[PDB]
Amino acid sequence: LSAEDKKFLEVERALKEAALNPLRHATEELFGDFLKMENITEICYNGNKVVWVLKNNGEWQPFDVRDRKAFSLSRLMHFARCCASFKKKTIDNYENPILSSNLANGERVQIVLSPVTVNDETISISIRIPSKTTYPHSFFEEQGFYNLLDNKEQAISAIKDGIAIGKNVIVCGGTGSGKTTYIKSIMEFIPKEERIISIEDTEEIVFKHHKNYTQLFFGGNITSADCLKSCLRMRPDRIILGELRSSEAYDFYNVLCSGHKGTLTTLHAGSSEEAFIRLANMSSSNSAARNIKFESLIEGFKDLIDMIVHINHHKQCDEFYIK
Amino acid sequence: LSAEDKKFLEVERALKEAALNPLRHATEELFGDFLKMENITEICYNGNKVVWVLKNNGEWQPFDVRDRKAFSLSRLMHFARCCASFKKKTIDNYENPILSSNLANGERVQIVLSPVTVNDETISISIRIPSKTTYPHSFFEEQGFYNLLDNKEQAISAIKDGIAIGKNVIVCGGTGSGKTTYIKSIMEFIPKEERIISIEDTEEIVFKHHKNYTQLFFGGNITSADCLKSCLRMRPDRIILGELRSSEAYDFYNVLCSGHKGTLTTLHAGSSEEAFIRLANMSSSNSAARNIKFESLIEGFKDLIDMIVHINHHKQCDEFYIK
Amino acid sequence: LSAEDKKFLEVERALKEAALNPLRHATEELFGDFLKMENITEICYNGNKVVWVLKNNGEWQPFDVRDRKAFSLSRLMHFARCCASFKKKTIDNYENPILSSNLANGERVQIVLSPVTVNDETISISIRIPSKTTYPHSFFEEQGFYNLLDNKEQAISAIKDGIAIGKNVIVCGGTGSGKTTYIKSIMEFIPKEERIISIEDTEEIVFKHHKNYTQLFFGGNITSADCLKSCLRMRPDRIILGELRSSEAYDFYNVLCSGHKGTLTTLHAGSSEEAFIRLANMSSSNSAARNIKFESLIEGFKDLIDMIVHINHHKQCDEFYIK
Amino acid sequence: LSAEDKKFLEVERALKEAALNPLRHATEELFGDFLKMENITEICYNGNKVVWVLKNNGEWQPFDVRDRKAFSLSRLMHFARCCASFKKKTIDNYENPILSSNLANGERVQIVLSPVTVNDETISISIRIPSKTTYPHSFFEEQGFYNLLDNKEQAISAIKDGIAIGKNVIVCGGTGSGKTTYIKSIMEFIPKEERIISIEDTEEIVFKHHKNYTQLFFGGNITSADCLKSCLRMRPDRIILGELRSSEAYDFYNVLCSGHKGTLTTLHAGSSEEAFIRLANMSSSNSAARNIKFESLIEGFKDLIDMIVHINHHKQCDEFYIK
């Protein structure tokens, strides 16, 4: 089969690998060193000859590249273009000065050029390093994840038992707060017989205890809602929504209204009460919600969401909303 | 007549059977074995050389196909395309990566390709086996369908008598909860003289006790609402709506408002109170509902729906809402 | 004049009669026998070689046509097409599988073909036999039409006197409940000097006691609202709206708001309270109602509608709402 | 000047009078006799060889024309077309079966043809005779116009004094109730120095006591609102709105909100409370009202309208709302 599968992939691979190699060398050439760094969460470039790296410990570390070819207005632009074309987009100094794309391996990239940056020699790049490690839940308890909670044992058991029964759980907090990481470890408590479907933007979730599953990715023409909609047609036992965005927003409510099993998703929210408002908002953006009272959605999400876990900027649970 | 009916069908049959045969062999070739399995509810493929089958008893069973030609990226793609073309759709790795269609006999098929699947060697297929059996109502009582209810006799008699008088009844619950099945058996209690019209997506309902009837199917160009709208022009005594979707949603409310006889339909809802909300939601999606207060619909459905029956994941009634 | 009127009609008649004859023979050929049957209300065909006829007494009678040429897939399709073209529409197995048209004499026809019907040999036809008889009001009293009412004399006199004074009256109930028939007999109590205008879909109303009048028909490009709008420009004393549909819905409210005389109309509603909701709904569908509070319409119709009469499935008044 | 005015009008006159003459002879030819009848309010034809005329005393009088050439399907059609073309419209038996236009002198005409009329030999015409006489107010008092009122003197003086001060007054009631007439007589009490602007559909208002004035007519391209909008740019002391229609509806509210002087208009409403609702409705039809609470308009009109006078079907004031 592989002999035929290869000849069958040949055409697409050639095409893809004819746009992914130029980008691979450029990436390698510029941010290669930094990408090798362990425990980092972001790599930024403020077109000022210095590369700023954000570490898991929340510390920004600057690096000097004054004397490097890979950081020439031209060498930079070539990498920029490599990013646009990869995701089939264009990047220039007129109509498309701002850009959003990805690297060869999947990391999100944010590129900005003049006239949007302060001058014509400033090229702003911002790469987001996904969750590339899986620590067991126990690891989280050890590091004292539920230490700020007064319902410490109640929480540690709620999460374990709850998820095992298929409650709808939301993990929220700020950027890089460790939400994705957290949901990844608590997956240990989902019966290994459950068919799981995940909707991601970047492959981040890993299935260490589940043979039957399937991953879905949105981006470009295909939308987050498209994945979730397809998801509900693929007979899932558990649906792991990388992170509620805005498209899924409303369709997520309906999925909850049909009394759907184990839902687990991360979201940008500063707390439980906030998450609830956060959801109503995003839902109301969808036309289908047009005729539904706003304060009617919040109550709606408040009946459906079983438990919420919020994580502060110090990667620690500081709120464990239940029921 | 058959001699002319044949020559008259000849042209359409040729055309149809020139797109249905390629699909039949592919189907047969790949999921032939699995489709033959008794008491299954879904057949999934996660493009990882293993076929997962979900049994009626809720158990997932993996089957190895590492050494089968029918599971070659090419052999799989040919079957995929056969599905697209059958329902007159296209499936590719650019604009049409996700697909929804059917098999030669009517079973729903969900196909997903790269870039939506994790890689270019993953082809996700999800086949849903319809309700292909009819157990008498008595069979449900024997298996203790109304055993979790405290109003056990009241329930078993309500359903029987109610339906016989033409009350509006909704059967709700999760996917594969046995709703389609349940309504099919309780049809025994509808006077055999009643002209029945059903709106389905896949032939599933069977008329074992009714000579005068007619089945309607939506899909593609023709919408669920279209069928129901035509239905109301075909002089029905009972209308069996396969399952409230969203188009019919509002038009179903109006049909209830005109005080229509015996309505029976399945719906995705986790309970009685949920079904009510579920309906208001779907109704409000229809423009015609634009000027109608949301909390006005729920009350609306709550006056019209005579009785609701919810089935848990263990195929058992756990709620018997009435009046 | 007739000599010239004939030469003047010649062109249109030729055209019309060149599409109405093909349809006449086909009709005659297939459902000719059944159409001759007295006291029937519907003739259905479930493309299964059996013709089902619904009688006034609410009984379904099957007839075998296994051995009849008029019921050959081809012979059927020819009649089908004859129906489309007549009303200037198309009927096929692709974009136009469902059809709604009429017969040579005016009866509504509902035709459905594959892929909407279960298979390619099933052709569903449903003809609605209009009200083709006029029983005097006295006949209704004799058959005990107001017998279920406790305000028996009050009702029999209300209807008589009310209509004589030009109150707005609505006759509602299910399909074939005898509404049109009822309004037709109670017309006896409208001063013979009143100019009456009727808006129908199929000629059904007959003027036995009124010389000055005019009938209006909607269908195709011309809408129900168009007739009513023209109606209000033809100086009517009484307006008989065959049956409130949805277009007239709102324009009917305004007509009531201008304090218009004797309005009489039939409607699909299961009761008085229902009719009121039924109206608000239909009105809110019209854009012009966009800025009007829904609960504001119901109250609106409740101030305007003088009396409502509902008829159960046994062709008997079971509710006589007044004031 | 007349010598040049003639040569200057020559071109337009020729054109107009080349479409108005054909119509004049047809008119003359058919309804010539009837149009000559004194005290009539409508002339209808139900394409059944009989001409029905409605007299001021509310009596319908039938006239036989069985033996007249002017009533030949052709002779009738020629007159019909003459009406269409006059107002630059088309009338046929397909897309333009219904028609609304006018006669050589301005009377509204409603023409209906098959398929909208019952058959192809029925041509329905409905002519409305405008208010072609002016009876002094005193004449109304003599005929006992304010006789049903208990506030008889208060009413007769309110109208006189009120109007003299420029209050906003509405005259409402049914069709032909004598509203147009009533307002025309009460104009006697408007200081002769007032510049008056009227917005009509058909010249009906006459200025017997006012030298400074100007009449405006809407129809076709030009809308009722257009006239009123131009009106407010022509420095009016009094604005006589023939009859609130729907366009002016909202723009009338704003005109009242700017505290405008003497407004006088007729409206189709069955009473004071009704007129108020009637107004809110029509206002809410205008987009500009989109963001304005419905129950906010009624209160709005209720602050602005100074006094309303309703006339029953017997041409008598039966309600004299004030303040």
Added chain:
Amino acid sequence: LSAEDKKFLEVERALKEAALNPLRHATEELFGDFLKMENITEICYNGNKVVWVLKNNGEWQPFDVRDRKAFSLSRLMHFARCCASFKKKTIDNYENPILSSNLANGERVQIVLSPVTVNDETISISIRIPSKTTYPHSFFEEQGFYNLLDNKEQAISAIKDGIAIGKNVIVCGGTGSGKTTYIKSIMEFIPKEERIISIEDTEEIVFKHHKNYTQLFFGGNITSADCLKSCLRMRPDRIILGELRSSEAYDFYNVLCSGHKGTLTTLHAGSSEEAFIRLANMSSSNSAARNIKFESLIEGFKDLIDMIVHINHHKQCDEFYIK
């Protein structure tokens, strides 16, 4: 500079002065005499050979022009056309029968032709004479402008002091009530150092005590809102809005919400409470107000507007709302 400025203006001037001269002679030719008349406010023509002039004292004076060439259907039309073309518009007897334009000097003109006027010999013209005089505030006190007020000294001082501090003041009343005139005199109390920007339709405001200022005019493609929007970009100390219209309506609210200094504007409103409603209305017409509660605007304007002055038809303050 003038030598070059002339050669620089040459092109535009030629063009403008090649359309303004034809209009100058026509104007001069027809309404030349009347325009010379002192203390007039409007000049109307009802195409009946008589010219009606409205004097400041509120008296209408007719003038006979039966024997004047300037009033020939042709001589009139030439002037009419001169008006259209000037403001780059068209005026005819078909699609553009109504017209709005201006004269060589800026006065608003309203022209109406058949079929909108009663006949083909009636040409209605209405010229509005702007405020062409500036009376000192003292002049207003002398003529007893604040004489009907009980808070006579409080009012005379409020206006003086208030405006000096930059409160938001609205002057409202009917047409020609003397609002523009009033605001023009009270400008005396604005510190001469304030940079003032005015948004007018016709130059009317005069700056007698302010060197630093700038006038803005809307008309044609440029809208009232455009001026105000530009205004807020020209660093104004005081903004004099000729008169709130409808475009500025909402943008005026926001300007008040940002806590902007000295706003002074005239408006058509019959009183303080009315002005407040008047504003909410106009604001709600703007899309940007779409999601803002109507009763939320009124309160909004009621917090922002510092003081309102209303003037009756006798050019006298009759309401001095404050705080």
Added chain:
Amino acid sequence: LSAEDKKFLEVERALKEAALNPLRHATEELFGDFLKMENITEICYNGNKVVWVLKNNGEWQPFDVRDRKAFSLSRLMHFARCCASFKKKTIDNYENPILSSNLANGERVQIVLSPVTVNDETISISIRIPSKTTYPHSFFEEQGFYNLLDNKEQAISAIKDGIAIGKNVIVCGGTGSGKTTYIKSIMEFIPKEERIISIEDTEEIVFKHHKNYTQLFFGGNITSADCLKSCLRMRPDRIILGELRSSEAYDFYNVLCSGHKGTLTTLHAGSSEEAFIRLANMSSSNSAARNIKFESLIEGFKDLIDMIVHINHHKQCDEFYIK
């Protein structure tokens, strides 16, 4: 790298500097002298040969240019066009009479021409001088910035501590009130380790204590929201929004709802309570807010905004809203 960076910029620089030089000389030629003046805030020209300059101390100073070539209708127009073309816009006396652009260095320019200005010799220019200086916070305390406050120490410490913790703070007041300035000094209290992203319209913010940062500019094709949206993808610790405009308005609410760190922005509002209303308004302009109750936004912003500081026209804090 510089050798290649130059050859790489060469093409864009040539182009830009081929449109920026003409503008530089014109600028220099006309407002060169004024631009050199210290402590000014605006430079206006009212096309009347006098240049008005507004000084920091709020004083308007007139300068005579009667005898200068740079102020010739032509010389002025050339500079005007230079402005249009620079920002790729057009400026003429027909469709583009009003203009908004910038100067060679970034200062906003407002140009107005006839017919919008009073005549064809009036060319109105309004130049706004950005914040080109940075006074330490201490400097503000010395000049008694918090002197009008009663919570003087509480305020001076709130700002210092609050900002250090990353509270959301809004600085509001009138134009040129010193907001841009104020926020710039209080930046001293943001841990130097924070990555800061600013969204400006004109480079004004200066980073004196922050190495890791990036500036964003909107204008033309690129919108304020675009920058903020990109901002949220560039991993910011603090987001300095030049000044809430209207696009960001709603997207700012959501950013607050996700519980985002340190937000600091200036806004046009006359006070705390006003700012709150100001925000709800701007938010409701965005479609995404369509389904969100207005009074729901104000409460929303009132939960999220930590502290507001308002500055009167005398550049002094007069309100210090907290919590």
